[PDB]
Design a protein around this ligand. Structure first.
Ligand SMILES: *[C@@H]1O[C@H](CO)[C@@H](O[C@@H]2O[C@H](CO)[C@@H](O)[C@H](O)[C@H]2NC(C)=O)[C@H](O)[C@H]1NC(C)=O
Ligand SMILES: *[C@@H]1O[C@H](CO)[C@@H](O[C@@H]2O[C@H](CO)[C@@H](O)[C@H](O)[C@H]2NC(C)=O)[C@H](O)[C@H]1NC(C)=O
Ligand SMILES: *[C@@H]1O[C@H](CO)[C@@H](O)[C@H](O)[C@H]1NC(C)=O
Ligand SMILES: *[C@@H]1O[C@H](CO)[C@@H](O)[C@H](O)[C@H]1NC(C)=O
Ligand SMILES: *[C@@H]1O[C@H](CO)[C@@H](O)[C@H](O)[C@H]1NC(C)=O
Ligand SMILES: *[C@@H]1O[C@H](CO)[C@@H](O)[C@H](O)[C@H]1NC(C)=O
Ligand SMILES: *[C@@H]1O[C@H](CO)[C@@H](O)[C@H](O)[C@H]1NC(C)=O
Ligand SMILES: *[C@@H]1O[C@H](CO)[C@@H](O)[C@H](O)[C@H]1NC(C)=O
Ligand SMILES: *[C@@H]1O[C@H](CO)[C@@H](O)[C@H](O)[C@H]1NC(C)=O
Lengths: 298, 234, 248
């Protein structure tokens, strides 16, 4: 009843958090959903001697993800599983201190993303299959089939090297590409420190939620941090004075958390725009920009 | 939309669908209504428990998103009702790839597409003393000892107001000399009369620019009429 | 000739424009009329500018609405607090009210700062798009319209800008058998630009983004190496233009 006199603070915080939650799905849609059709590979897998079995989807897995995608998903430890609990496992109370249920009891919840990992893998599979089977044409219009040797010759002719350099060295170039994919596998299976850019995305939200839980133990100058204790031990006249401090302190902590979430959402939106630009200009075509997509000639 | 219908689906977030008949108004709840919870229109999603929408296996495009690949719409699937479905990613295609076959286009088309980008927003200013207290000398005297907070918010809003004009100048003022078109309008058979300026209007704007200015329901953002209409009683 | 050089920038030779100029002009006029009809009918394309106006109006209305809140005081009316309470209790309620209103105004200032940063990023993107698509031609994929970019036209808008990106899109396709190179006399002939095509009877050479078959001669092909190395090379005769003029 006393919180109703403080105005539209809760409604504007909820509006900002709803805007951030819509913006995350907009970022994911903008990055991944760039092709209007779901292309797929032919059953034969002879792409001019190049081996694409590590990045093509594996049907043996329950979710159609490739070997490298499975390696990345195993490398990232996703600790922010909010609605996987579904509050039944939180209602069954355990003596172990579970961090997701403890913050779930405090009003802090995590909404699931709109696009699941299966749909993201289907988007990446369609993009990679269209890239392999058609080149740059499916980013400009209908996909046009072309042999992969002719496509590699045309990619070399883009960077100023004639086609006979490929057509007299195609087996060597395929061997180098397969060895590079194998070295990518050997690097990702051992060096787990490369995915810190996503591990920090997990940790910056987990630490913020843990801090927001830890702010309740602060007294903010009151006699206690338990409002039932204050109401049971004081009259209403000085109890309102004691409880106004707690209400103002917790509201300021919530506003601080919302402001930091807004700044982090701005940074994440900038990174998502960069990722969408990189996808459109390097997956859907060849880039002449120096060091935009890898050191060397793209 | 309320113009379309008044049928409503209710989603309980983070709640198992077995716990929702327990969370019915036989025991008291925060909302008074419970009449949705009785019925056969109960579906379970990773977002929670959806009530009032029948699940349909036919995947369409996402109309109203819910979560974890579930969307909902208002369709004639029965006679109108709210339906819930898995979202469709697009039409499935298979490129007829072979190592001796190529497809080369024999024709083209010219497509002119439209892209809209915001440039500047509204420049605002706040009178700190009159907003905080308002025609009150004692409250102004009490506000004077609180600090230079009003000065630093004035500084921040002035920086924003300068930055808006900087953005507009940087976007538009990229040409050294104001060029003008010749009176002859034969640009190789291309019709540019819908984007070239029309001198009939008092402001030399094109038909498409007039359409954009009509379509954007802009507020005042200026055009104050110098305090006269606000001072006049209305 | 300006549009011919725009076509020559994207890998299509200018004879295509000089033989299809009336058709391309008619297609451009039809697309302009379609944009006119779409902007006359649908008003949901300007949602970004409309959301800018709605965000500013909503923030100002929220800042106006924050004055009626009590913030724990006995009343939101400062003159009523003056006329009812004594000096020290009145100063307590004024301290509560000024703290609440100052916190609301700081929240408004912070939200305006974040929104101004987002608007500045969008304005920098718009300036880059104007400088690289109106003042020139863009080779960046999907930066200015889907397809191959030709031109762009700027249009003003309330609190923003509108770009009309003109693009070239290939439309009607046809299957063709292809080969990387050609054996003529043991030499390996490679095309200079274009694709070696056939239907099964005769071998021609085309360009990539348009179908235009030409006789495979030594003017548009170059010799590199021999036939033993290239995988998938077919045998075919290569025409020599010098021999009939020598025999004439
Ligand atoms: C392409 O690469 C794959 C993977 O390197 C090869 O498939 C086999 O993959 C398993 C792992 O799942 C390895 O242990 C085997 O050594 C791989 N080879 C064989 C013969 O089983 C696949 O053979 C490669 N194909 C080509 C044409 O190079
Ligand atoms: C390439 O596409 C254009 C546009 O579809 C074709 O132009 C059309 O030709 C038919 C011929 O019967 C006319 O009826 C249409 O009115 C034309 N459309 C326009 C926009 O003028 C063109 O014929 C196609 N093929 C060629 C030869 O380029
Ligand atoms: C809901 O509860 C039932 C019974 O306890 C269980 O079988 C089901 O898996 C649960 N679903 C979710 C999403 O938690
Ligand atoms: C959807 O499919 C499942 C299994 O194929 C079936 O049991 C169910 O009745 C279907 N629902 C509709 C609405 O067709
Ligand atoms: C083309 O692909 C088929 C299918 O794998 C393969 O058998 C054949 O050797 C390839 N090359 C040619 C020149 O047909
Ligand atoms: C100021 O007031 C006069 C009084 O009629 C009016 O005519 C004039 O237009 C006003 N100035 C402006 C800028 O509107
Ligand atoms: C090329 O051939 C494939 C298979 O024969 C067919 O599916 C495809 O439609 C053909 N393309 C055209 C443009 O006819
Ligand atoms: C297609 O086949 C016909 C057979 O009559 C031939 O005259 C023509 O040159 C061929 N065209 C191409 C592009 O191979
Ligand atoms: C015809 O082309 C094939 C393709 O490799 C080649 O093996 C053969 O030697 C050629 N014919 C002659 C007479 O050289």
């Amino acid at each position: 009843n006393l919180l109703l006199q403080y105005g539209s603070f809760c409604t504007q915080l909820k509006r900002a958090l709803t805007g951030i939650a819509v913006e995350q799905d907009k970022n994911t849609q903008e990055v991944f959903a760039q092709v209007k059709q779901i292309y797929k590979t032919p059953p034969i897998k002879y792409f001019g001697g190049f081996n694409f079995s590590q990045i093509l989807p594996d049907p043996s897995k329950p979710s159609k993800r490739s070997f490298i995608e499975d390696l990345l998903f195993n490398k990232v430890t996703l600790a922010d599983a909010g609605f996987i609990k579904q509050y039944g496992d939180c209602l069954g109370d355990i003596a172990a201190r579970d961090l997701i249920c403890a913050q779930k009891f405090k009003g802090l919840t995590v909404l699931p993303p709109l696009l699941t990992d299966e749909m993201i893998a289907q988007y990446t599979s369609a993009l990679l299959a269209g890239t392999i089977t058609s080149g740059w044409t499916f980013g400009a219009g209908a996909a046009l089939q072309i042999p992969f040797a002719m496509q590699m010759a045309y990619r070399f002719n883009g960077i100023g090297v004639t086609q006979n350099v490929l057509y007299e060295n195609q087996k060597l170039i395929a061997n180098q590409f397969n060895s590079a994919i194998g070295k990518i596998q050997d690097s990702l299976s051992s060096t787990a420190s490369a995915l810190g850019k996503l591990q920090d995305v997990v940790n910056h939200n987990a630490q913020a939620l843990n801090t927001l839980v830890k702010q309740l133990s602060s007294k903010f100058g009151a006699i206690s941090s338990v409002l039932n204790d204050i109401f049971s031990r004081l009259d209403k006249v000085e109890a309102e004075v004691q409880i106004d401090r707690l209400i103002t302190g917790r509201l300021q902590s919530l506003q601080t958390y919302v402001t930091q979430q807004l700044i982090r959402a701005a940074e994440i939106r900038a990174s998502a725009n960069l990722a969408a630009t990189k996808m459109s200009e390097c997956v859907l075509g060849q880039s002449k920009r120096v060091d935009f997509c890898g050191k060397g000639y793209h | 939309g309320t113009n379309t219908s008044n049928q409503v689906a209710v989603l309980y977030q983070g709640v198992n669908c077995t716990e929702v008949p327990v969370a019915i108004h036989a025991d008291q709840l925060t909302p008074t209504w419970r009449v949705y919870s009785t019925g056969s229109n109960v579906f379970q999603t990773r977002a929670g428990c959806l009530i009032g929408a029948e699940y349909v296996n036919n995947s369409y495009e996402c109309d109203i998103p819910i979560g974890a690949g579930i969307c909902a719409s208002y369709q004639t699937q029965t006679s109108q009702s709210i339906i819930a479905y898995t979202m469709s990613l697009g039409a499935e295609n298979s490129v007829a790839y072979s190592n001796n076959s190529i497809a080369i286009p024999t024709n083209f088309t010219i497509s002119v597409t439209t892209e809209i980008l915001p440039v500047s927003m509204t420049k605002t200013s706040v009178d700190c003393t009159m907003y905080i207290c308002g025609d009150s000398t004692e409250c102004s005297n009490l506000l004077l000892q609180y600090g230079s907070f009003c000065t630093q918010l004035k500084r921040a809003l002035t920086g924003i107001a300068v930055e808006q004009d900087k953005n507009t100048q940087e976007v538009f003022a990229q040409v050294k000399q104001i060029y003008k078109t010749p009176p002859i309008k034969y640009f190789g058979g291309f019709n540019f009369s819908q984007i070239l300026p029309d001198p009939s209007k008092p402001s030399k704007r094109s038909f498409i620019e007039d359409l954009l200015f009509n379509k954007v329901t802009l507020a005042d953002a200026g055009f104050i009429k110098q305090y006269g209409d606000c001072l006049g009683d209305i | 000739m300006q549009m011919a050089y725009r076509f020559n920038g994207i890998g299509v030779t200018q004879n295509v424009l000089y033989e299809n100029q009336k058709l391309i002009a008619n297609q451009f006029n039809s697309a302009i009329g379609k944009i006119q009809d779409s902007l006359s009918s649908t008003a949901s394309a300007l949602g970004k500018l409309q959301d800018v106006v709605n965000h500013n109006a909503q923030a100002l209305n929220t800042l106006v609405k924050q004055l009626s809140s009590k913030f724990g005081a006995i009343s939101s009316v400062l003159n009523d607090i003056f006329s009812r309470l004594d000096k020290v209790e009145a100063e307590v309620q004024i301290d509560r009210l000024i703290t609440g209103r100052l916190q609301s105004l700081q929240t408004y200032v912070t939200q305006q700062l974040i929104r101004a940063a987002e608007i500045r990023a969008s304005a920098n993107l718009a300036a880059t798009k104007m400088s690289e698509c109106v003042l020139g031609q863009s080779k960046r994929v999907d930066f200015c319209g889907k397809g191959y970019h030709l031109m762009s036209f700027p249009q003003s808008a309330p609190h923003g800008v509108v770009f009309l990106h003109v693009t070239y899109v290939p439309a009607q396709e046809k299957n063709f058998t292809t080969a990387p190179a050609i054996c003529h006399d043991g030499k390996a002939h490679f095309p200079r630009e274009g694709v070696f095509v056939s239907n099964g009877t005769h071998w021609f050479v085309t360009q990539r983004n348009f179908y235009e078959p030409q006789i495979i001669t030594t003017d548009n092909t170059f010799v590199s190496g021999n036939c033993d190395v290239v995988i998938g090379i077919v045998n075919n005769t290569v025409y020599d233009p010098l021999q009939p003029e020598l025999d004439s």
